[PDB]
């Protein structure tokens, strides 16, 4: 995918509501960095819905694909209110420049 697309689509979707840089703050929702490979619900010292804590899967690219376009529907009860991206070449762009930003 493409990381300078997936950078734009990160600020103007996501950024109000997260950081991804190491020790980002916590805003609406939670830092970003290192979610690879991580578990849901793992951000340091962010207080998670019960849903988001207890989702149990691993964070990937193929769990950020399905989760992004819909993520209520992957995660009900969840207080993240974003409606979703429905094109899977933006999906795959935003999640490009995540792999980058969140291991960076
Ligand atoms: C822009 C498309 C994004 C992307 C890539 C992500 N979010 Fe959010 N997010 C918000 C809140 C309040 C939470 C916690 C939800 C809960 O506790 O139920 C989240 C959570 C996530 C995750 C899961 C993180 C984990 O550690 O499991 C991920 C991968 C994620 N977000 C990505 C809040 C917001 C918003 C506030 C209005 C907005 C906009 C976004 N998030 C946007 C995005």
């Given at each position: 995918g493409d990381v300078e697309k997936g950078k734009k689509i990160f600020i103007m979707k996501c950024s109000?509501?997260?950081?991804?840089?190491?020790?980002?703050?916590?805003?609406?929702?939670?830092?970003?960095?290192?979610?690879?490979?991580?578990?849901?619900?793992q951000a340091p010292g962010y207080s998670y819905t019960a849903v988001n804590k207890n989702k149990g899967i691993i964070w990937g690219e193929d769990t950020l694909m399905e989760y992004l376009e819909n993520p209520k529907k992957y995660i009900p009860g969840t207080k993240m209110i974003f409606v979703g991206i429905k094109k899977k070449e933006?999906?795959?762009?935003?999640?490009?420049?995540?792999?980058?930003?969140?291991?960076?």
């Open positions: 109000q509501c997260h950081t991804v840089e190491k020790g980002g703050k916590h805003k609406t929702g939670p830092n970003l960095h290192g979610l690879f490979g991580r578990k849901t619900g933006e999906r795959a762009d935003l999640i490009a420049y995540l792999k980058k930003a969140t291991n960076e």
